[PDB]
Design a protein around this ligand. Structure first.
Ligand SMILES: CSCC[C@H](NC(N)=O)C(=O)O
Length: 278
């Protein structure tokens, strides 16, 4: 399948070269997979989700996304126009308040929730979790992310936005999950992207158009935007049977475009997520 005039990031993950605008992908499109977006919520009523998004947990007085960040990330995973995996099921877990903030204890609880809740959901092709959040190093946060991965969920986490080594951020620094840096449309490391040996992969992160609250769209930047490209790609590849939740990060790195990015510090992987479709 071909989506013309797609957001640059979708085109980039289906291309061996920058500077194209069509997204090519197998029509299975992540059908039968599920992606949990652990964030500020998801505006599930947005027409772009077509009934495939659902809030399943909140730790606050409402499950509404009053911020927009979670809705934008969910749109990059799986919205019809702006999403990698256009037939996946999206589940929202609101661990962040409408200012984008949350206690580590709440974030940990949300990760434990996903590890159990996936047993109440029909996801025969596999389960992914997208975590576009983080803060300073916490062994407890890293352990929660490791538990979620171990339970059989492909966990993708943002590297962080401090132009610093991600070894000092969590869950970014947890080795067993997939840590995602950000690139721009000219194949440069995004100026804010964390780096370091803990990174596993880069995805599009600068100037990413996706869904927003109030039934709108907008373009924003961050490793928060690169992460759902990788999460959606994992769901897509798991639906095709190419990989599993346990192996998907390694598979994405093995099949990535290699050596295409500039401004990559010595010791950081030069790998850009790629779907290998055509
Ligand atoms: C009609 S929406 C197209 C959005 C635009 N796409 C590309 N390829 O530049 C962008 O990513 O900004």
């Amino acid at each position: 399948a071909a989506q013309t005039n797609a957001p640059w990031g979708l085109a980039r993950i289906s291309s061996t070269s920058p500077g194209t605008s069509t997204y090519y992908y197998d029509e299975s499109a992540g059908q039968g997979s599920c992606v949990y977006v652990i964030d500020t919520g998801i505006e599930a009523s947005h027409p772009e989700f077509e009934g495939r998004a659902q809030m399943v947990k909140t730790y606050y007085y409402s499950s509404r996304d009053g911020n927009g960040h979670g809705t934008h990330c969910a749109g990059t995973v799986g919205s019809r126009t702006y999403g990698v995996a256009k037939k996946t099921q999206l589940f929202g877990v609101k661990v962040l308040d409408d200012n984008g903030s949350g206690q580590y204890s709440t974030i940990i609880a949300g990760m434990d929730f996903v590890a159990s809740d996936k047993n109440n959901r029909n996801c025969p092709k596999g389960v992914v979790a997208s975590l576009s959040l983080g803060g300073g190093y916490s062994s407890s946060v890293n352990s929660a992310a490791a538990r979620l991965q171990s339970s059989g969920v492909m966990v993708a986490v943002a590297a962080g936005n401090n132009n610093a080594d991600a070894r000092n951020y969590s869950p970014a620094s947890e080795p067993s999950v997939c840590t995602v840096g950000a690139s721009d449309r000219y194949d440069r490391r995004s100026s804010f992207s964390n780096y370091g040996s803990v990174l596993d992969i880069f995805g599009p992160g600068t100037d990413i158009l996706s869904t927003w609250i109030g039934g709108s769209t907008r373009s924003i930047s961050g490793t928060s935007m690169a992460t759902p490209h990788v999460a959606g790609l994992a769901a897509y590849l798991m639906t095709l049977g190419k990989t599993t939740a346990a192996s998907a990060c390694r598979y994405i790195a093995d099949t990535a475009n290699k050596g295409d990015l500039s401004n990559i510090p010595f010791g950081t992987v030069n790998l850009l997520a790629y779907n290998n479709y055509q």
